[PDB]
Structure 1
Amino acid sequence: AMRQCAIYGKGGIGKSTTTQNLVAALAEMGKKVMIVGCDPKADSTRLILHSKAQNTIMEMAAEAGTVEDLELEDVLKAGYGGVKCVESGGPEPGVGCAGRGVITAINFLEEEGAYEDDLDFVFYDVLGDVVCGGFAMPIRENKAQEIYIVCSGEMMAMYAANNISKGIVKYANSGSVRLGGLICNSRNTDREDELIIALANKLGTQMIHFVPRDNVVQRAEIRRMTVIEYDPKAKQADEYRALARKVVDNKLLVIPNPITMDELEELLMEFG
């Protein structure tokens, strides 16, 4: 078996930093992991690969002729801890559907046997500002059974969490896609942990971890590394190790209860 997890959230909230560091901690533990980038930004694997970014399946298919001219070894690349990495890509802005590459990538990986029995986890890093087209496909087509939403006390980040939760509810009658938890990626504000705990309780889930804001993240990423690799003794490395432990141990997977905008606004008003 292998656990299929997807990390969703609004743009810029910390999906790729959180996912790559969580995955590095899992590999440090001895887990075998694959990351599938499902965001057109296409930099979801750079900290595992020590790279600028990664060439995408859409790009490589175009240069090769068809996606069938590609082999799994051409697309999947291994980095820190043996973590295997692939990027979906997507059409240029203004052309097509921004999520179309995700459909191509996930189908290619399934057909080519990337889901080898020895994998312990697959993580999809998915754009979450809209839940449609290829960005909805991991939910609609039962690809990521466990959704973790990165958010913060930002109203827009909590709105995004609610919208993603509505997408999960929409497909609850088929497949097994469930909300596994919220991850608070701190803005360094007071009571923020309590605010995201309260939101998680209202949705029916839990705050799996509170990730502090720590400049060591920037220092690591300037060097194209996770904090886990860059400075294994850092306090922030231990934070990502705690997050990884709690993801591994998590057993709560729910059909969430989306809230009203009145409920969201009351949360922010209350926690001042």
Structure 2
Amino acid sequence: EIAPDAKKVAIYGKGGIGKSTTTQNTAAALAYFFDKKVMIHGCDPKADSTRMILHGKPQDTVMDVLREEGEEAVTLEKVRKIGFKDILCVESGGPEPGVGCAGRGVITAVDMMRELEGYPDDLDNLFFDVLGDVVCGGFAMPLRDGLAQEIYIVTSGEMMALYAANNIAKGILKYAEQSGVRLGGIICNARNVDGEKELMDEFCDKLGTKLIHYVPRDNIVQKAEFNKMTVIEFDPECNQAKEYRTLAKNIDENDELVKPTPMTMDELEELVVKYGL
């Protein structure tokens, strides 16, 4: 059993909207503000889900080490690094270019970490940062396998971002009965578009879920990331750090998860027309 006493969560979302930045800062805020043992297992082959916790040194992926150095080289000292506030970090990596299923590569990396006993039993929080650009059978494997039954969807007030969120919701619904997976809520990484908060409220209401937090747009993210670090580490006192603190508190106390009611093509089109997207 992977981290039986931890709150295991899966963060799914499209790329290009700050999903990795929000996940890293949420983990940092749990470790920093609530003294929690945290781990992040990256499951997005096109995103660096741990660099800001590792102060800008990108870690080797489990799959790349297995493909280039071999299975024996896949060791905890090699693929699992410790970062800000002792957060543990692991990156699954991608499949054999042009041949392997990327969702299978994710599961192989998780299985390999299991065999290595790489998930501390005293973890308080484990995050799996999964690609949500496409809810293909491969990237839905974490949902089918119940890697984590608490799922959060990162979105933004942009058409493709909401389409992806709605499709992640369909994938959660697909396996809710079989794997017990549930939607804990929607995280909006604000894009700052007219009506964005109202759009998010309606979106959440139509899917039968809730907005766990509206993460504002703040240039301190770029300043902190420029120093290859999280906002929490860069300046724990600033307003954006307190936003991530509230998000982290909300995701960690949450005990009301739901089987989502995704919107149909026509309903989604009506919604993005109403808010002029």
- On the 8 A contact 1:48/1:226 being kept in 2, the answer is yes
Instruction: Tell me the residue number matched to 2:242.
Output: 238
Instruction: Tell me the residue number matched to 1:38.
Output: 43
Report the secondary structure of 1:173's partner residue. Answer: helix
1:47-58 mapped onto 2 (5 Å cutoff): 47-58=52-63
Task: Select the residue among 114, 131, 153 that pairs with 1:149.
Answer: 153
1:112-261 mapped onto 2 (5 Å cutoff): 112-261=116-265
- On the 8 A contact 2:7/2:252 being kept in 1, the answer is no
Q: How many Å apart are 1:65 and its aligned residue?
A: 2.0
- On the 8 A contact 1:43/1:52 being kept in 2, the answer is no
Q: How many Å apart are 1:60 and its aligned residue?
A: 1.4
Distance 1:175 1:73 in 2: 32
Q: How many Å apart are 1:247 and its aligned residue?
A: 0.7
Q: How many Å apart are 1:140 and its aligned residue?
A: 0.8
Deviations 1:62-90 (A, max 9, x none): 34321x54222321101001000000111
Distance 1:258 1:22 in 2: 26
Q: Does 1:89 align with 2:93?
A: yes
Deviations 1:85-142 (A, max 9, x none): 0001113653432333202111112222223221011101111112235421110101
Cα gap change, 1:197/1:261 in structure 2, threshold over 3 Å: closer, same or farther?
Answer: same
Q: Does 1:62 align with 2:67?
A: yes
Which moved further from structure 2: 76-85 or 36-45?
Answer: 36-45
Task: Select the residue among 105, 108, 113 that pairs with 1:109.
Answer: 113
Which moved further from structure 2: 127-136 or 192-201?
Answer: 127-136
Distance 1:242 1:190 in 2: 24
Q: Does 1:5 align with 2:9?
A: yes
Distance 1:69 1:271 in 2: 52
- On the 8 A contact 2:59/2:79 being kept in 1, the answer is no
Alignment: residue pair count = 271
- On the 8 A contact 1:150/1:182 being kept in 2, the answer is yes
* TM-score in terms of structure 1 length: 0.94
Report the secondary structure of 2:202's partner residue. Answer: helix
- Percentage identity across paired residues of the two chains: 65
> Structure 2: which 5+ residue stretches go unaligned?
none
Distance 1:159 1:188 in 2: 18
Aligned letter for 2:69? A
Aligned letter for 1:176? G
Report the secondary structure of 2:143's partner residue. Answer: helix
CA RMSD of aligned residues (A): 1.6
Cα gap change, 1:85/1:134 in structure 2, threshold over 3 Å: closer, same or farther?
Answer: farther
Cα gap change, 1:129/1:162 in structure 2, threshold over 3 Å: closer, same or farther?
Answer: same
Distance 1:24 1:227 in 2: 9
Distance 2:146 2:126 in 1: 13
Distance 1:235 1:174 in 2: 41
